[PDB]
């Protein structure tokens, strides 16, 4: 069937989401997430002005050709704006394909590899003690895995944060020791370094946290230069995760083939969608690398639903990040995935199981919001 | 030097251009090119909606902090939309800094390294003979170097058909014919334009060795930088690449492994003066030279800035020149000059280019997309 219409919806039910909807001549439709936190309107414009017009009249079934057509045909390849636009088309087309097949997406991908999908929750606190409090209540909700963060003692437009690597490196290991002491060894414990360290500093932290056996240490260092990971890998056996800021298999091909990481984090909506992420997950699996999808509030329920289908099929699934959306957001994007006892159960409706309530979306207009920046104590613009 | 206002101007004097203007409290102003061919409005929105608001009240003198603030601060780093926005801010700020120094841009960068800037012109025809005709008229205009392309016998993106096999048997004939008619002193360039695999490019490289091309450009898509290795190992024809690149991380390995002779990434797509200086300096460690992409889809803002850059950079190779239309030149008044095949940098403070806003408003945006390429069986290929 041919594409009859395509358009974007921008809405802000708690925060900004951009969605692409594709409608075939028969009236069937699918949607894809296009949300890029803090640069939302770049993608919306990419879609509205440059992609949407070229979609009209194309065969909706040609997912692969459409992917190559937009990826190669853009001429300027890769990039967060570019690949998020491409991902949103791709997700919308897989939705349509699964619908046309009368199957939930995970079936169309090759069927289930697991009965449920393990997640992790964010647990954040100013003091180590405050964080311990959040772990407890998330454990009470059934989470088997938690990502822990505390403050560091002595420390619409972008907020500006101040950062000290040295104080942080001295403090962080104390948090994990406290986590193990209170909660024991069976809990999976994750930590997000969030781009702030140099490699040798990350090597040092990894070694210092070996006794607490983290499920992963994430985003140790900025990794545009993929060799940045080598010194870390050579000095510690703490498992490493990276990639939420990546958008292309070429951002991580060497990290994977050289075995510098244990989990790849690039998610569906930023990583060129289902079509591309299958390739990424498959390359990862030759080297024992597992999936750990970025799943913050700034990817919509459209992505999450699709992510849960993918998580359900993919052989080398690792863990799915879960930052729960607001009630308002869950209402804009009705969905049939379920959360029970710390795990996701994939939906059984044909498609990725997510839709968008356009009328409700129109009640919440766009509100500009930017991500923070980080500066060192001397005012040096650092990595947030 | 606080920024009072910043905004974009979109205009289509023969083709689409997006320009960023920044204006400080004291009234001094600067402009940067933000044109991304076929995706123009993505950059416009990136700038208008996410960058501009954050520029207001910033110290315009803090060029480096602004670059890092936009680069790191975006969180999602690199990419053609991202780095074009960043390049526009950066070029506009260097414009302001040069004006404040009362110097033309090249003086600010370390001064003149050459007296003029050699260019090459495009020479295209349907048959070899049509192309040789174009080569003649461009030599007559004074060009010392020509990029030659001929046809191969046998609002939305246009759709072209392509045959690698027919191209590889045909292309070396073009170069033989150019040498037969024009001799050995003319510099002859060729743009493969992404269509080949590495071993196919290796073959073509070897076939054209007797013709001594100035460069063979964009042999293979190079998101995977290792794609250049088989070519380099099999031919001594010089290799050029990078017009579709936007980061030093797109070509760091290409340079350090000595897989290329000329880096093509231009100011407007390569993060501006601040980033391209660093790329140029990495390249110089390995004898790699600059060969800035210079088509009609980069504005005269970029061209003037590029000519200043070309004038200072030690490892200059060549500057591509596709003449802009008269309407375009009128929208973007400038003090660079073209004479006898070469550019001469302007002497006005700044990069020497301005935009005439009243004139620009007379040419509204018109959507135009780059073509796609398909193989004979329908395969969506590289254009
Ligand atoms: O692993 N999750 C994270 O690092 C998030 O909290 C990110 O800072 C935001 O999603 C940025 O859009
Ligand atoms: O070397 N020059 C070229 O390859 C040009 O003809 C490009 O296809 C266009 O500028 C793309 O925007
Ligand atoms: Co993270
Ligand atoms: Co080219």
Give B 94-123 residues with CB within 8 A of chain A. Answer: none
State the pairing for strand pair A263-264/A117-125. unpaired
Residue B170 sits at φ, ψ, to 5 deg, of: -90, -45
B142: which DSSP letter? T
Same domain for B340 and B357, yes or no, is: no
Element spanning A344, H or E: strand A343-345
What would the two tokens of residue A50 be? 């440059």
Tell me if B157 and A54 make a contact (CB, 8 A cut-off). yes
Same domain for A69 and A109, yes or no, is: no
State the pairing for strand pair B380-381/A117-125. unpaired
Q: Which of A318, A279, A302 is nearest to A352 (CA)?
A: A302
Q: At A348, is the secondary structure helix, strand, or coil?
A: coil
For A232-248, letters b (16+ CB in 10 Å) and e give: bbeebebbbbbbbbbbb
Instruction: Say what the resolution is, in angstroms.
Output: 1.9
Tell me if A76 and B244 make a contact (CB, 8 A cut-off). yes
Atom of ligand 2 nearest to the CA of B298: 10
Q: At A118, is the secondary structure helix, strand, or coil?
A: strand
Would you say the C-alpha torsion A52, A18, A94, A101 has a positive or negative sign? negative
Distance CA B212, CA B215 (A): 8
Distance CA B114, CA B104 (A): 15
- Tell whether A124 lies on the interface with B, counting CB pairs under 8 A: no
- Tell whether A69 lies on the interface with B, counting CB pairs under 8 A: yes
What would the two tokens of residue B311 be? 């004038």
Given a contact cutoff of 8 angstroms between Cβ atoms, the answer to whether B302 and B121 are in contact is no
Q: Helix H segments across chain A?
A: 40-45, 52-55, 63-73, 80-100, 105-108, 128-140, 165-183, 199-208, 230-235, 253-257, 273-286, 301-313, 327-332, 358-361
What would the two tokens of residue A127 be? 């003091």
Same domain for B182 and B266, yes or no, is: yes
CA of A50 to the centre of ligand 2 (A): 18
Q: What does B330-372 look like in DSSP terms, one character per residue?
A: HHS-B--EEETTEEE---SSBSSB---HHHHTTS--------E
Alpha-carbon distance values, B171 to A22, B72, B127, B138, B227 (Å): 43, 44, 11, 20, 21
What is the maximum span of chain B, computed from C-alpha positions, in angstroms? 62
Residue A185 sits at φ, ψ, to 5 deg, of: -95, -20
Elucidation technique: X-ray
Atom of ligand 2 nearest to the CA of B383: 8
Distance CA B93, CA B350 (A): 10
Same domain for B117 and B139, yes or no, is: yes
Given a contact cutoff of 8 angstroms between Cβ atoms, the answer to whether B216 and B241 are in contact is no
Same domain for B259 and B178, yes or no, is: yes
When CB atoms are compared, the residue of A77, A81, A373 closest to B223 is A77
A chain contacts of residue B65, beta-carbon cutoff 8 Å: 381
Is residue A316 within 6 Å of ligand 1 at its C-beta? no
- Tell whether A250 lies on the interface with B, counting CB pairs under 8 A: yes
Distance of CA A47 to the CA centre of its chain: 21
Same domain for B370 and B267, yes or no, is: no
What would the two tokens of residue B70 be? 């936009």
Given a contact cutoff of 8 angstroms between Cβ atoms, the answer to whether A202 and A221 are in contact is yes
Given a contact cutoff of 8 angstroms between Cβ atoms, the answer to whether A47 and A31 are in contact is no
Residue A176 sits at φ, ψ, to 5 deg, of: -65, -40
CA of B370 to the centre of ligand 2 (A): 9
Given a contact cutoff of 8 angstroms between Cβ atoms, the answer to whether A152 and A164 are in contact is yes
Given a contact cutoff of 8 angstroms between Cβ atoms, the answer to whether B116 and B318 are in contact is no
* B193 part of the active site: yes
Same domain for A157 and A287, yes or no, is: yes
A23 strand-pairing partners: A5, A29
- A282: CATH: 3.20.20.120
Residue A245: closest CA among chain B residues belongs to which residue?
Answer: B76
A118 strand-pairing partners: A343
Distance of CA A190 to the CA centre of its chain: 15
Residue with structure tokens 């190079």?
A: B222
Same domain for A93 and A139, yes or no, is: no
Distance CA A260, CA A233 (A): 6
Given a contact cutoff of 8 angstroms between Cβ atoms, the answer to whether B43 and A34 are in contact is no
Distance CA B109, CA B86 (A): 19
Same domain for A337 and A377, yes or no, is: no
Q: Helix H segments across chain B?
A: 40-45, 52-55, 63-73, 80-101, 105-108, 128-140, 164-182, 198-207, 229-234, 252-256, 272-285, 300-312, 326-331, 357-360
Same domain for B252 and B189, yes or no, is: yes
What would the two tokens of residue A35 be? 């949300």
Is residue A134 within 6 Å of ligand 1 at its C-beta? no
Given a contact cutoff of 8 angstroms between Cβ atoms, the answer to whether A272 and A67 are in contact is yes
B117 strand-pairing partners: B343
A chain contacts of residue B370, beta-carbon cutoff 8 Å: 73-75
Same domain for A51 and A90, yes or no, is: yes
- Tell whether B36 lies on the interface with A, counting CB pairs under 8 A: yes
Q: Is B243 annotated as a binding residue?
A: yes
When CB atoms are compared, the residue of B43, B82, B370 closest to A75 is B370
CA of A192 to the centre of ligand 1 (A): 9
- B53: CATH: 3.30.390.10
- Tell whether A43 lies on the interface with B, counting CB pairs under 8 A: yes
Given a contact cutoff of 8 angstroms between Cβ atoms, the answer to whether B1 and B28 are in contact is yes
Number of structural domains (chain A) is 2
Q: What angle do CA B218, A68, B245 make, to 5 degrees?
A: 35
CA of B217 to the centre of ligand 2 (A): 11
Instruction: Tell the burial category of B277 from Cβ atoms under 10 Å away from its Cβ (0-12, 13-18, 19+).
Output: middle
In 10 A of CB A363, how many CB atoms? 12
| Crossing angle of the two packed helices B80-101 and B300-312, in degrees rounded to 10 | 70
Q: What does B71-120 look like in DSSP terms, one character per residue?
A: HHHTSS---HHHHHHHHHHHHHHHHHHHHHHTSBHHHHTT--S-SSEEEE
Same domain for B30 and B136, yes or no, is: no
Distance CA B246, CA A384 (A): 22
Give B 177-206 residues with CB within 8 A of chain A. Answer: none
Q: Which domain holds residue B2?
A: 1-104+348-383
- Return binding residues of A for Mg(2+): 192, 218, 244
Which residues of A belong to the active site?
194
Q: What angle do CA B196, B278, B6 make, to 5 degrees?
A: 100
Residue with structure tokens 């660079």?
A: B336
Element spanning A188, H or E: strand A188-192
Is residue B243 within 6 Å of ligand 2 at its C-beta? yes
- Show contacts of B357-363: CB within 8 Å, 24+ apart: B357/B9, B359/B13, B359/B330, B359/B331, B360/B9, B360/B11, B360/B13, B360/B19, B360/B331, B361/B11, B363/B11, B363/B12, B363/B13, B363/B14, B363/B327, B363/B331
CA of A293 to the centre of ligand 3 (A): 10
Residue with structure tokens 């959040």?
A: A134
A chain contacts of residue B46, beta-carbon cutoff 8 Å: 39, 41-42, 45, 81
Given a contact cutoff of 8 angstroms between Cβ atoms, the answer to whether A364 and A328 are in contact is yes
């Amino acid at each position: 069937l041919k594409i009859r219409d395509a358009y974007t919806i921008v809405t802000c039910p708690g925060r900004n989401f951009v969605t692409l909807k594709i409608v075939t001549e028969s009236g069937t439709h699918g949607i894809g997430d296009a949300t890029l936190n803090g640069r939302e309107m770049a993608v919306a414009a990419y879609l509205d002005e440059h992609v949407v017009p070229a979609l009209i009249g194309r065969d909706a079934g040609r997912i692969e050709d459409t992917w190559q057509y937009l990826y190669r045909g853009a001429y300027w390849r890769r990039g967060p704006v570019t690949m998020t636009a491409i991902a949103a088309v791709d997700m919308a087309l897989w939705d349509i394909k699964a619908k046309a097949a009368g199957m939930p997406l995970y079936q169309l991908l090759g069927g289930k590899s697991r009965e449920r999908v393990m997640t992790y929750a964010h647990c954040t606190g100013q003091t180590i003690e405050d964080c311990l409090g959040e772990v407890a209540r998330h454990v009470e909700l059934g989470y088997r895995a938690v990502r822990v963060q505390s403050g560091v003692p002595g420390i619409s437009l972008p907020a500006e944060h101040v950062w000290s690597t040295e104080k942080y490196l001295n403090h962080a290991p104390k948090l994990f020791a406290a986590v193990r002491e209170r909660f024991g060894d069976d809990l999976h414990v994750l930590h997000d370094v969030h781009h702030r360290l140099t490699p040798i500093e990350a090597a040092r932290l990894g070694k210092a946290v070996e006794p607490y056996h983290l499920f992963w240490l994430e985003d140790c260092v900025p990794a545009e230069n993929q060799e940045s990971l080598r010194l870390i890998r050579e000095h510690t056996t703490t498992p490493l995760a990276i990639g939420e800021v990546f958008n292309s298999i070429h951002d991580c091909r060497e990290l994977i083939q050289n075995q510098w990481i244990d989990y790849i984090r690039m998610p569906l909506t930023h990583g060129g969608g289902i079509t591309a992420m299958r390739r990424v997950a498959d390359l990862a699996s030759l080297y024992h690398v597992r999936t750990g999808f970025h799943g913050p509030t700034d990817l919509s329920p459209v992505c999450l639903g699709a992510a849960i289908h993918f998580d359900t099929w993919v052989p080398n699934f690792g863990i799915q990040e879960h930052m729960p959306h607001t009630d308002e957001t869950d209402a804009v994007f009705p969905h049939d995935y379920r959360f029970e006892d710390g795990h996701f159960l994939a939906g059984e409706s044909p498609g990725h199981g997510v839709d968008i309530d356009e009328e409700l979306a129109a009640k919440y207009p766009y509100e500009r919001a930017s991500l923070p920046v980080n500066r060192l104590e001397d005012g040096t613009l650092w990595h947030w």
